Write a protein that binds this ligand. Sequence first.
Ligand SMILES: Nc1ncnc2c1ncn2[C@@H]1O[C@H](COP(=O)(O)OP(=O)(O)NP(=O)(O)O)[C@@H](O)[C@H]1O
Ligand SMILES: O=C(NOCCO)c1oc2ccncc2c1Nc1ccc(C2CC2)cc1F
Ligand SMILES: [Mg+2]
Length: 286
Amino acid sequence: MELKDDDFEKISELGAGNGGVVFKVSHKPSGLVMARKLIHLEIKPAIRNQIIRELQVLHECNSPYIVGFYGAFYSDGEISICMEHMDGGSLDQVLKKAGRIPEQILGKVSIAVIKGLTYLREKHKIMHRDVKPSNILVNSRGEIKLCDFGVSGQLIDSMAVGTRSYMSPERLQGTHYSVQSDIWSMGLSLVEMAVGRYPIPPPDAKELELMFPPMAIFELLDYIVNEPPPKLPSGVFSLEFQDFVNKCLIKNPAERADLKQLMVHAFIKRSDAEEVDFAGWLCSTI
Ligand SMILES: Nc1ncnc2c1ncn2[C@@H]1O[C@H](COP(=O)(O)OP(=O)(O)NP(=O)(O)O)[C@@H](O)[C@H]1O
Ligand SMILES: O=C(NOCCO)c1oc2ccncc2c1Nc1ccc(C2CC2)cc1F
Ligand SMILES: [Mg+2]
């Protein structure tokens, strides 16, 4: 069935970001609750068609690890993407209430992200391009799914920054980037979720014993691309987790681990085995 603007009705607002705003909406004709992302773009009907046309491949993106697609259309200066409402929000949100995320959970998240990136790569030749905690959604059935990935080339072009980059050093420095870049974004996200805050600059020895100003733009990018990469603090994380993220945060994208390798890494194999009531822990956390 086709989706259109008048067939919808706002329930609440799920939040916004750089460029987009997302509503919890009811699709009157189906009765389905959906998340509707609106993206403001002043753009000629020729390209706004190609964008909508390119977004249709989302209908073919079905995975337990990828957020469901209902449909996409253009309204009034805004292209809408309608998707599965994830009643548990983004890991960004859960990080806020949770403070830290237990290594055991993170291992479950890691599994989802890898399988999800793998799905997008293997079955669609799509790289994510924007991996961070807010584009990893969770729900009450304990599912973990990726969203806001780079399906439509033209949309990418039409959106052509903030105070926190999850961009790999190679992408910060040029155009010489690709799927390895997502691995970095993951690594960083995990360290952030692991620790409780954005890992750059790394915490003082003090700040660490405590757990257990905001940087200038250039000052931060200059760190990412030129200082050694962040690390899980010794001691309170398994040696396997530490190696996992260290492999993700290698500065040279060709030396950096790839999806193949991470999938059979000690940490993943170990997390695969662990009995974790992710669902139970999530709701407990809310
Ligand atoms: N499908 C969804 N279901 C439930 N909540 C969602 C969904 N999509 C987005 N959200 C929420 O809406 C918030 C803002 O979404 P979004 O416009 O994509 O930007 P962001 O990921 O928060 N930050 P940014 O990537 O810098 O724009 C997210 O943090 C989620 O909490
Ligand atoms: O959200 C994006 N950027 O977030 C900044 C907004 O504040 C985004 O950037 C894209 C670039 C190219 N094609 C698509 C998207 C896309 N959005 C998107 C992609 C996939 C899905 C799957 C159905 C769940 C949902 C989406 F909303
Ligand atoms: Mg987003």
